[PDB]
Amino acid sequence: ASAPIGSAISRNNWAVTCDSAQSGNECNKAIDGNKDTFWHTFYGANGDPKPPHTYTIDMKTTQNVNGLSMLPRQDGNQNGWIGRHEVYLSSDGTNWGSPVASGSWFADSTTKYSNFETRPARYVRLVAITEANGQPWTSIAEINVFQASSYTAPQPGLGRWGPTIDLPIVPAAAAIEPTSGRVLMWSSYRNDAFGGSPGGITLTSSWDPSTGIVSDRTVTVTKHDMFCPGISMDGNGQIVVTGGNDAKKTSLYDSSSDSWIPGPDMQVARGYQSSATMSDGRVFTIGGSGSGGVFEKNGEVYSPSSKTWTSLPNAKVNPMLTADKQGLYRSDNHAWLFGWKKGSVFQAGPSTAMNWYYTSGSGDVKSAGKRQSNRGVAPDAMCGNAVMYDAVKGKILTFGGSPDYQDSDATTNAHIITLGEPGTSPNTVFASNGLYFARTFHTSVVLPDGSTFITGGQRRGIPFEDSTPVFTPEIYVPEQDTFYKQNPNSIVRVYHSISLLLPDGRVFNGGGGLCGDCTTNHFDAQIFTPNYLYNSNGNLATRPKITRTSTQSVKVGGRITISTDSSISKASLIRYGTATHTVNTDQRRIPLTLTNNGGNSYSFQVPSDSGVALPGYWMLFVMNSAGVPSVASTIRVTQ
Ligand SMILES: [Cu+2]
Ligand code: NA
Numbered sequence: 001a002s003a004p005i006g007s008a009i010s011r012n013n014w015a016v017t018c019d020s021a022q023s024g025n026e027c028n029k030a031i032d033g034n035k036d037t038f039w040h041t042f043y044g045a046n047g048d049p050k051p052p053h054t055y056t057i058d059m060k061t062t063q064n065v066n067g068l069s070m071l072p073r074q075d076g077n078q079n080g081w082i083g084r085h086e087v088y089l090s091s092d093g094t095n096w097g098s099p100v101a102s103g104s105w106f107a108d109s110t111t112k113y114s115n116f117e118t119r120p121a122r123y124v125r126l127v128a129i130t131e132a133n134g135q136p137w138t139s140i141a142e143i144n145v146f147q148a149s150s151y152t153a154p155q156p157g158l159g160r161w162g163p164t165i166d167l168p169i170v171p172a173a174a175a176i177e178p179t180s181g182r183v184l185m186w187s188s189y190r191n192d193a194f195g196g197s198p199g200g201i202t203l204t205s206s207w208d209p210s211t212g213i214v215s216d217r218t219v220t221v222t223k224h225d226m227f228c229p230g231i232s233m234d235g236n237g238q239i240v241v242t243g244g245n246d247a248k249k250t251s252l253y254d255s256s257s258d259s260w261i262p263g264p265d266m267q268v269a270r271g272y273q274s275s276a277t278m279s280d281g282r283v284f285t286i287g288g289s290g291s292g293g294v295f296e297k298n299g300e301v302y303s304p305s306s307k308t309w310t311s312l313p314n315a316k317v318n319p320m321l322t323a324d325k326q327g328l329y330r331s332d333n334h335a336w337l338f339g340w341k342k343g344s345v346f347q348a349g350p351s352t353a354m355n356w357y358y359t360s361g362s363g364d365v366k367s368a369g370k371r372q373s374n375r376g377v378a379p380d381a382m383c384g385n386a387v388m389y390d391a392v393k394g395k396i397l398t399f400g401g402s403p404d405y406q407d408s409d410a411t412t413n414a415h416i417i418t419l420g421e422p423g424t425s426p427n428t429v430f431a432s433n434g435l436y437f438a439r440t441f442h443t444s445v446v447l448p449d450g451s452t453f454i455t456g457g458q459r460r461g462i463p464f465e466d467s468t469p470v471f472t473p474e475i476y477v478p479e480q481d482t483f484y485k486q487n488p489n490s491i492v493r494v495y496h497s498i499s500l501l502l503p504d505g506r507v508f509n510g511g512g513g514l515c516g517d518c519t520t521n522h523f524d525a526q527i528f529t530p531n532y533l534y535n536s537n538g539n540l541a542t543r544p545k546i547t548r549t550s551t552q553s554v555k556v557g558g559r560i561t562i563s564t565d566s567s568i569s570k571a572s573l574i575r576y577g578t579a580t581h582t583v584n585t586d587q588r589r590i591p592l593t594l595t596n597n598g599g600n601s602y603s604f605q606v607p608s609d610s611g612v613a614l615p616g617y618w619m620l621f622v623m624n625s626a627g628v629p630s631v632a633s634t635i636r637v638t639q
Contacts, residue, residue: 003519005115005490006066006146015058020049030055030140038073038141040080051131053138057124057145058093064151065089065124066490067115071142074109080139081107081132084214085166087114089121096125103166103207104214106191106523107132115491115524116164118148148490156538157531158487159473165525168216169205171511172496173580175231175239178617178634179255181503183207185510188227188245191523193516197245202226207525209502222251222262227514228290230273231578233586235281235615236304237636239578242285243270247292250302250309255617267311268297276337276345276585279611281639284345284359287317287332294328299363315363322351322380323403330405336386337585338396341611344422348386348396352378356422366423371398371415373430378413379403383461383581385444387452388588389478391612394419397431397452397476402440402461409460410440414476414483432481437470443499443582445507446589448572448621448629449532452476455509456493464515466492473528491526498579501587503619503632505533532627544568544622544630553636556615557608560635564600566624571604573635574619588614610639 011031018027018039025040041053072081087101101114124145128138154160170192171185186204188194200223205216219226225245232240239253240263247270250263271291276284283302289295299315302308317332324330336348345357346368354371358364371378384401388394396417402408412434418427435454442457453475459468471488489509497511510525535541548563571594577587590613595603602622607613619632 001110001517001519002113002521002523004067004069004113004146006148009059009063009145009147011144013060015060017056017058019054022046030143035071035074035141038139040139041137043137048136050136051128051138053128055126055140055143059122059124059145062091062120062122063145064118064148065121065145066118066148067113067146068124068126069142069144069146070112070126070140072109072112073139073141078133079135080137082112082128082138083107083132084129086127086129087116088125088127089119090123090125091121093123099163101164101166102212103524104168104216105132105166106168113523114164114166117162117490118151120151154487158485159531160529161487161489161526163527165207165214165510165527167205167214167510167523167525169203170496170514170521170523171205171498171525172227172514173229173231174498174500175253175578176500176502176576177206177255177258178576180258181209183209183500183508184253186226187514189225192514192521194227194245194514195516197225199225199246209504219260222249222260224249224251226251228271229580230270230275230285230288231580231583231586232275232277232283233576233578233616234277234283234302234304235639237617238304240275240283240302242266242275243273243288244291247271264307264309266309267300269293270297272333272581274335274337274583274585276339277614277616278339278343278345278359279341279614280343281615282359284337284357286315286357287320287335289329289332297332299357301359312359312363315357315359316365319353319355319365319367320347320351322382324380324382325404330382333405334383334581334583336398338388339611339614340419341422341609344611346419348398348417350382350384350401351380354426358422369425371417372428373415375430378415379411381411381413383440385442385454385582387444387446387584389446389450389452391588391590392607395478399431399435399454400439400442400457406461406463410438410458412438431476432483436474436483436485437472439470441494441497441582442470443493443497443509443579445499445501445577445584446574446587447501447530448505448574448623449570449627450478450572450589450591453499453507453528453530455499455528456497458494463495464513464518464520466494466520469494489526491522491524493522496581500577500579501574505621505629505631506530532629541626541628543628544624546620546622546630546633549633552634553638554606556606556610556613556637556639559603559605561597561601561603562622564602564622567600568602568622569625570623571602572621573606574621575614576617576619586616606637613637615639
């Protein structure tokens with residue numbers, strides 16, 4: 001089940017309009033209060049008109065609308081379940097504009113929801129594009145519109161939230177498909193739960209940013225239930241998904257062919273582990289006692305060329321453990337791993353002790369000191385994030401988290417870690433005065449300008465509960481060493497939530513829940529459009545365009561020559577991310593040093609060290625004098 005974000009509006013003076021309505025199944029039979037009666041479109045004697053079908057509401061007066069609900073027919077018949085839909089709002093009743101919520105709903109008889117940002121309106125409209133099984137009809141038992149307590153206009157220069165993307169599943173895990181631009185999402189064996197899994201099945205869903213179509217799929221070929229995994233993009237351009245409910249399995253996703261290929265089994269059975277792509281294109285993973293048993297799980301490496309998993313027992317998991325109250329079951333989870341120089345992997349936390357991991361031979365480990373500052377020694381920060389915003393200078397920003405996984409208070413702790421050569425202890429200082437709001441179970445992404453977008457979370461970590469939420473997002477600008485509060489949202493994004501950077505420069509934020517009978521399931525996602533895409537008037541600014549590229553595939557140390565339509569100031573390369581349970585080891589940014597050739601032609605060099613410039617797919621963004629970025633050009637880096 002799910003829950004709305006507002007309170008129900010009285011339907012006593014409502015006037016409804018429909019495109020088609022049968023005798024006995026009228027248009028007003030959706031607002032009467034009876035769970036057994038329903039509105040239904042023309043069938044039988046009146047013919048069978050195909051979708052789009054529309055339902056328009058007139059609330060007589062202006063209300064502060066923040067969502068709607070749709071209860072299907074409860075008579076056991078499938079005829080009329082709404083699949084693809086669109087929600088519109090208006091003040092006049094003729095000019096509707098752009099949709100506040102669009103997407104697809106699951107094929108069942110449960111109550112469906114569309115939760116969006118507060119916007120004052122008198123007229124509400126629900127358009128049913130398709131039927132769940134592809135039939136000509138549309139039916140609704142009960143339709144309600146919800147309102148917020150008050151409305152406050154969004155502050156200029158602090159971004160905008162919206163629109164909402166309705167999904168058939170709860171996206172607990174996600175990744176961007178580089179070659180197509182789509183957002184691949186997955187849950188478990190079911191759309192709303194994970195417990196009591198038979199194994200061998202994962203339900204996936206994808207969203208296209210250009211078309212707006214949401215299409216679901218069922219993956220059984222890999223014999224893996226991909227809930228609670230370790231995700232990494234290898235050097236061969238394939239997404240390596242490891243463990244979880246089927247603790248020993250590995251699944252590979254190829255973006256070019258849009259298919260799932262079976263991978264070889266791991267040496268050790270894991271769950272809730274973090275995996276990281278190395279300098280040679282290989283994938284390293286360590287720990288993970290979330291599933292497959294509770295014991296000492298040391299490191300292991302995946303080779304994409306030979307299709308094998310090899311154990312590295314001397315790469316000890318013992319110095320990276322937290323002092324969690326639940327023991328080893330939670331202490332080796334969600335490691336802040338980063339692929340670095342000469343096959344090494346840096347562990348920034350969540351534990352107080354930071355370590356260097358080596359992959360040559362049977363593996364090795366060395367102490368990198370404690371995560372600290374002049375404010376003292378930093379405690380254990382489970383489910384806190386770690387983002388590499390400047391890979392050239394080895395800059396990592398760590399923030400949030402709590403001492404224990406569950407039933408523990410979060411802190412405002414924030415640090416800057418500067419990486420050098422493997423084996424040396426890095427310099428650690430405090431990032432400004434810390435976060436504005438203490439948060440755990442939060443997610444983050446690196447933006448084109450070097451800034452880090454932080455959103456969601458809760459003050460006290462209690463899984464499957466939406467208690468003490470943080471609605472206000474934060475942005476960290478490194479040049480000024482300052483945190484900035486952005487415009488707040490209305491949907492709670494706690495445990496099982498994700499955040500990914502879209503090729504168009506915007507942020508995809510969704511998920512939260514996945515507990516079955518709970519009312520905390522979020523079958524949606526929201527889009528955040530940052531300040532850099534807006535001008536002085538508050539409208540969408542003109543974005544510069546990359547007209548030509550010399551090559552789409554480059555090697556480490558090689559040069560690329562581009563051509564633009566206007567003058568640019570800065571340029572950056574961002575690696576495509578993957579997200580689940582606050583972990584994102586794939587994302588990183590490289591600031592580019594440009595050479596002006598003249599006539600809007602620029603040249604740059606991709607770093608020679610493959611530990612800085614990790615092999616895989618990257619996003620090319622160029623910024624003008626106003627700071628407005630372009631859309632991303634997909635560049636593949638090899639070694
Ligand atoms: Cu989980
Ligand atoms: Na009814």
